[PDB]
Amino acid sequence: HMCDAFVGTWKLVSSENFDDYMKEVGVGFATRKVAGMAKPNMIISVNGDVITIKSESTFKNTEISFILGQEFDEVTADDRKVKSTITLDGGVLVHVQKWDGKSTTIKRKREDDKLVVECVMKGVTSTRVYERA
Numbered sequence: 728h729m730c731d732a733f734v735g736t737w738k739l740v741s742s743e744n745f746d747d748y749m750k751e752v753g754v755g756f757a758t759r760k761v762a763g764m765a766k767p768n769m770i771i772s773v774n775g776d777v778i779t780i781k782s783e784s785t786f787k788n789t790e791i792s793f794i795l796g797q798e799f800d801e802v803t804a805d806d807r808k809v810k811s812t813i814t815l816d817g818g819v820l821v822h823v824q825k826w827d828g829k830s831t832t833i834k835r836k837r838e839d840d841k842l843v844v845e846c847v848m849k850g851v852t853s854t855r856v857y858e859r860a
């Protein structure tokens with residue numbers, strides 16, 4: 728019953744500061760423009776201890792499966808090769824990505840009927856809000 732309130736199909740409904748977050752991460756112009764247009768659907772499922780998060784969009788379909796606290800290799804939608812660890816901290820899914828001596832964190836939280844995604848790199852934060860599909 729780990730992650731129950733996250734499981735489902737979610738659709739992006741608002742974004743703030745994502746272009747700047749992507750700039751901070753190092754994403755180039757053309758990828759920022761096309762990625763920034765996307766309205767992904769995020770599909771979260773759990774089977775035993777394994778959590779799967781899929782994102783589907785016209786930019787780039789992704790899928791990660793993981794066990795909380797157990798590092799895995801991830802190729803991000805912007806083509807970074809990162810080492811990721813996802814944990815639950817006080818009901819918040821915390822997804823840390825390490826690459827080339829850098830770090831970024833993606834937090835996912837249930838707030839009312841929304842799933843709120845906060846992406847932080849150095850001093851730059853982007854907030855992306857999803858609704859049930």
Ligand SMILES: O=C(O)c1csc(COc2ccccc2Cl)n1
Pocket residue numbers: 748749752754762782803804805833844846855
């Ligand atoms: O909500 C997510 O899954 C999520 C937020 S940030 C991310 C990985 O980073 C990118 C993804 C697409 C374009 C540019 C970047 Cl930097 N995934």
